[PDB]
Unconditional design. Structure first.
Lengths: 118, 164, 23, 37, 194, 80, 137, 8, 146, 47, 43
RNA sequence: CUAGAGUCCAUAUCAACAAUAGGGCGACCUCGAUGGAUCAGGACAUCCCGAUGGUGCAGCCGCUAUUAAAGGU
RNA sequence: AAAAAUUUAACACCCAUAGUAGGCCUAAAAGCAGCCACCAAUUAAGAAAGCGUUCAAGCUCAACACAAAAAA
């Protein structure tokens, strides 16, 4: 589910990823939204690369990293899994997902006027 | 003494940062504390002056009528006063915000619902309803709200029933 | 009295008139 | 439009709004009053 | 005479006699012309600087045009340009100004707001920081600043350290800071600092 | 717009929404546009009636209402 | 419309002061110089008069007239032909209270629909204060 | 039903 | 509340206004939220608190009607628009990247192309500066600029 | 110019607030001192 | 990009420097130590 | 900043006295070997081409502003 | 000893008659070309604070009511 990652704040349209092909006039800068649309797994791949140690081992370490945009995982890869790590950020609950038990548990805070159109 | 802000030494910079002012912080933001009771305001000269002439108008003259001074040009208002002046009718208007207390504590509290927005008070002696309903017959957009015929509260049809 | 406050109101507009000189 | 770091309303009909992360002065009676910071 | 007197460019008779040394006329608080004399509204110098003749003639063309002799008057508080400036090949006189100096004084049968309207416009065009000030705003500003030292919750202040040589910090502090109290730095001055 | 009529008894409550309505529509500032228009006020249940020359009818009972929406609803039907 | 101004009784067709001025208003130039002359001689002529002509689209003239202005009609009673210059210390006219007692009764007809008599005398004396006259007794 | 220090 | 109905006949009816809870823990307060000891104990995640001050279509109630703290009404305004564009209020719609803690509108921010040096580097803000006073259970203060 | 420092005599007055804060008795001053250098002598004046 | 004219730590246009949280924490704890020293030297 | 030009009119355009920002004399390295041709890389503070506001923009021409360096000069 | 902070502009609603173009100077300049005085009708209105007219006309206000950035 690397396609469904979330950025805090406006990092989708503020953060950019600049690369150079080496030819004259070859400087290219694209934003996170453009990169994610073009490549759903590029964001996670680049984030890990910058945090890995900057030595010859980094290339070998990335060979043990596997990314998949959607819930589909290959059968061979899924067959050798051992442990599912917990998600770091707790997913906020939408307003509709709250059940009736907790909605009425939360008390009201104000008295609405009777004759207000709303 | 320079013109380029005279970049500061690191040791001096730390000294200024440590010795920065710290305002005192209350335990409870005063704004969310049961506010102190509001101080009553002194009554101005106008309020006492209007009340005594409001009382004098209310007692000296028999006819007190309720109307609304709808949006009208000054010339039309002036002639409306003139057409009332031909039959010894005098026109007086008072601020409504101050009429509310003067009416509720007296016997005439039944006229509170009439006085909400713009109001016109028609005051005359020896009332004769036939003449000024004719003057309001030629003007379709000026309605008679009500009034009292010698402390007898009546609606518009009550004024009309007295006319004939 | 009534004439005292009418003069007082005349002073207030006089004050506002001066305050709008540099407006 | 004209670039002005400080926006001033040159008539009573100039309405000031924030559009595209930028304060704008818009006018209809006098289109020359339009401003942009 | 409710108008600004003509100010000459260069002293008619050069009187270059200097009372002390140089470069010390911009740093430190002003010692003269600090209170209000025969006036109610003035402009306060929130920092040191030099006043060139163009600034003086600037005072003329922005104050007198927005002036009425009938109900308003103004006069000079800073002296005429007497300190010259040497100019080597790749001249003119200026008035030294310290922080807290009063540049011009105004008054009459008028309120602060009307005088504020044009005074602030002039205030923003001096080389140093300045702002319009009245006989009430100045004392209010001074009392507000004085209140700061009493409600301050910081146990450590500039005077408690510089005078006592707390951290051996007088090595990096000038001897002039025993009186500047850390609120003054070069030609600048920060009222916001305690 | 041909004829507008207002009917209200000021002696009860909830008549203030339509009482202030008169001070806006029954003004020469807006009546000058249609000099031949008709404005009549009779006093008896607050309610106003609006008649159009095309044949459209309008009934606006401002008991549980306010003047601001009454003014806006009047403007919407001007297009018709 | 309303074009309220002052009309000189002696002059009927001033020309440039009145011809081109109301030319854009769309009024009959010759209408003024015929009927106004009859209204000129009903009372003492040679005094300025107000105007009450209302301009209608159908090109009609209805001019009302009451009492003359307050400049000449007051200054003539004090025997002064030119108004004061300083108007604060310079003064050459004197009028008594009895003099005003007949100067305000006629004026209180340009409905000036005020009922009380004090409302008329107070207005002119305030106007008289601006002019260079003295109020005697 | 709620103590003075209650917090929803 | 009162609703208008059009069929020309129009009408207004009153239907089942909600009621305030009868026992506020901290009385003597002129404030809806600053009466339940909730001054610095809510965030953009709390939809239940935020949903009580919004129009059905996603707007905000005026201050004079709710009587909130002047500075807190700003916080409620800022928090609600954060939740609306975070997908937390899907039923209050007007008339695809998932985000959270978004201070500004997504379609009104210019991407940074030449970030500054190590001493003058432009920062991409997260959260809101109005929530500084919110309580923190970690001694590291909120990082409002990433 | 950087010279020696003349510490004001007002600094060394033990107010009653400091007495119970540090636990010292003005009536019975301590007999001896314990001194421990906790800063480098380098980057400091020769005196 | 990001050149500093002259040298980094000396010159008219130096590299700007700011204090940190622990930089303050170290200064106060040193100030408190002398406050103990100031009191014990007064008897 | 709004004195002053622009018939009127600060702000279509121009602009005084001033103020605030940004751009690239010293002897620190080297005393033991400028023009044109050709090829051009880059910035935009845009000469031309493009999109869009204002105008003392009727239309053609113009003036001023915003954005745009893919291409040409 | 030793880790930088910081994100900035909505806003009144309604209303207006009148001694009169207040006098002087001005071709005429009226609340607003300039000057001298600045009262006063009316519930409530400056002998006028701004635009506007050759000058008038026309409008609002006052009054009653309700804090920037750009180079290879
Ligand atoms: S009193 Fe606390 S929210 Fe207003
Ligand atoms: Mg270098
Ligand atoms: Mg460009
Ligand atoms: Zn405009």
């Amino acid at each position: 589910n690397t396609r469904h990652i979330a950025f805090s704040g406006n990092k989708w349209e503020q953060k950019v990823y600049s690369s150079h092909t080496g030819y004259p006039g070859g400087f290219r800068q694209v934003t996170a939204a453009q990169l994610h649309l073009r490549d759903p797994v590029a964001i996670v791949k680049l984030a890990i690369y910058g945090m890995l140690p900057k030595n010859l081992h980094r290339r070998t370490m990335m060979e043990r990293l596997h990314l998949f945009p959607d819930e589909y995982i290959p059968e061979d890869i899924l067959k050798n899994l051992v442990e599912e790590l917990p998600q770091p950020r707790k997913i906020p609950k939408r307003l509709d997902e709250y059940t009736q038990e907790e909605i009425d548990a939360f008390p009201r805070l104000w008295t609405p006027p009777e004759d207000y159109r709303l | 003494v320079t013109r380029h802000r005279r970049v500061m030494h690191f040791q001096r910079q730390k000294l200024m940062a440590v010795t920065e002012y710290i305002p005192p912080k209350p335990a409870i933001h005063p704004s969310c504390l049961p506010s102190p009771p509001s101080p009553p305001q002194e009554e101005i000269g106008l309020i006492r002056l209007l009340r005594r002439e409001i009382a004098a108008v209310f007692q000296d003259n028999r006819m007190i009528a309720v109307c609304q001074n709808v949006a009208l040009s000054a010339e039309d208002k002036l002639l409306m006063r003139h057409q009332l002046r031909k039959h010894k009718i005098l026109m007086k208007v008072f601020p409504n915000q101050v009429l509310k207390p003067f009416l509720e504590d007296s016997k005439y509290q039944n006229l509170l619902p009439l006085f909400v927005g713009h109001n016109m008070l028609l005051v005359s002696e020896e009332p004769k309803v036939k003449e000024m309903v004719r003057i309001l017959r030629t003007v379709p957009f000026l309605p008679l709200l009500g009034g009292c015929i010698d402390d007898t509260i009546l609606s518009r049809q009550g004024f009309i029933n007295y006319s004939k | 009295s009534r004439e005292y406050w009418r003069r007082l109101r005349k002073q207030n507009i006089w004050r506002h008139n001066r305050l709008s000189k540099n407006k | 439009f004209k670039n002005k770091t400080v926006l001033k309303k040159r008539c009573k009909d100039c309405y000031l709004v924030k559009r595209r992360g930028r304060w704008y002065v818009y006018c209809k009676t006098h289109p020359r009053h339009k401003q942009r910071q | 005479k409710p108008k600004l007197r003509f100010i000459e460019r260069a002293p008619l008779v050069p009187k270059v006699r200097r009372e002390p040394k140089n470069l010390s006329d911009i740093r430190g608080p002003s010692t003269e012309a600090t209170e209000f004399t025969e006036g109610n509204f003035a402009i306060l110098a929130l920092g040191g600087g030099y006043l060139h003749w163009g600034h003086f003639e600037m005072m003329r063309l922005t104050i007198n045009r927005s002036m009425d002799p009938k109900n308003m008057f103004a006069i000079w508080r800073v002296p005429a340009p007497f300190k010259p400036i040497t100019r080597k090949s790749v001249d003119h006189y200026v008035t030294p100004v310290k922080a807290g100096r009063l540049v011009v004084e105004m008054g009459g049968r008028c309120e602060f707001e009307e005088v504020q309207g044009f005074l602030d416009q002039v205030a923003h065009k001096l080389p140093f920081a300045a702002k319009a000030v009245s006989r009430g705003t100045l004392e209010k500003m001074r009392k507000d600043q004085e209140e700061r030292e009493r409600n301050n919750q910081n146990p450590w202040t500039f005077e408690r350290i510089a005078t006592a040589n707390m951290l051996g910090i007088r090595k990096v502090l000038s001897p002039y800071d025993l009186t500047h109290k850390g609120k003054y730095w070069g030609k600048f001055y920060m009222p916001k600092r305690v | 717009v041909k004829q507008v009529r207002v009917q209200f008894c000021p002696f009860e409550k909830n008549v203030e929404s339509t009482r202030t309505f008169l001070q806006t529509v029954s003004s020469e500032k807006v009546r000058s546009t249609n000099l031949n228009c008709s404005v009549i006020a009779d006093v008896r249940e607050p309610c106003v009636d609006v008649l159009f020359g095309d044949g459209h009818r309008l009934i606006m009972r401002g008991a549980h209402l306010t003047a601001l929406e009454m003014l806006t609803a009047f403007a919407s039907h001007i297009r018709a | 419309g309303v074009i309220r101004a002052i009309v000189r009784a002696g002059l009927a067709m001033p020309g440039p002061p009145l011809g081109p001025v109301l030319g854009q208003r769309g009024v009959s130039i010759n209408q003024f110089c015929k009927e106004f002359n009859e209204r000129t001689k009903d009372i003492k002529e040679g005094i300025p008069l107000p105007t009450k002509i209302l301009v209608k689209p159908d090109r009609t003239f209805e001019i009302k007239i009451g009492q003359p202005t307050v400049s000449y009609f007051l200054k003539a009673a004090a025997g002064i032909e030119k108004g004061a210059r300083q108007t604060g210390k310079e003064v050459a006219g004197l009028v008594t209270l009895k003099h005003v007692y007949e100067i305000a009764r006629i004026k209180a007809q340009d409905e000036l629909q005020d009922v009380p008599l004090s409302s008329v005398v107070r207005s002119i004396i305030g106007s008289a204060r601006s002019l260079g006259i003295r109020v005697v007794k | 039903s709620y103590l003075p220090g209650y917090v929803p | 509340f009162r609703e208008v109905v059009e069929t020309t006949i129009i009408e207004g009816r009153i239907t089942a206004t909600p009621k305030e809870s009868p026992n506020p823990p901290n009385p003597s307060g002129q404030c809806p939220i600053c009466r339940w000891n909730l001054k610095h104990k809510y965030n953009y995640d709390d939809v239940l608190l935020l949903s009580q001050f919004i129009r059905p279509h996603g707007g905000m109630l005026p201050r004079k009607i709710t009587g909130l703290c002047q500075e807190e009404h700003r916080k409620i305004e800022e928090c609600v628009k954060m939740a609306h564009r975070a997908g937390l209020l899907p039923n209050h719609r007007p008339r695809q990247l998932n985000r959270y803690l978004t201070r500004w509108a997504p379609g009104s921010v210019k991407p940074i192309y030449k970030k500054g040096p190590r001493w003058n580097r432009v920062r991409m803000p997260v959260g809101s500066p109005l929530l500084r006073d919110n309580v923190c259970y970690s001694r590291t203060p909120w990082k409002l600029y990433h | 110019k950087f010279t020696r420092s003349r510490i004001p005599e007002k600094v060394f007055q033990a107010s009653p607030e400091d007495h119970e804060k540090y636990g010292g008795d003005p009536q019975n001053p301590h007999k001896l001192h314990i001194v421990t250098r906790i800063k480098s002598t380098r980057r400091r004046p020769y005196w | 990009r990001g050149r500093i004219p002259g040298r980094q730590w000396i010159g008219k246009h130096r590299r700007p420097r700011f204090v940190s949280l622990r930089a303050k924490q170290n200064m106060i704890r040193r100030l408190e130590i002398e406050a103990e020293n100031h009191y014990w030297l007064s008897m």
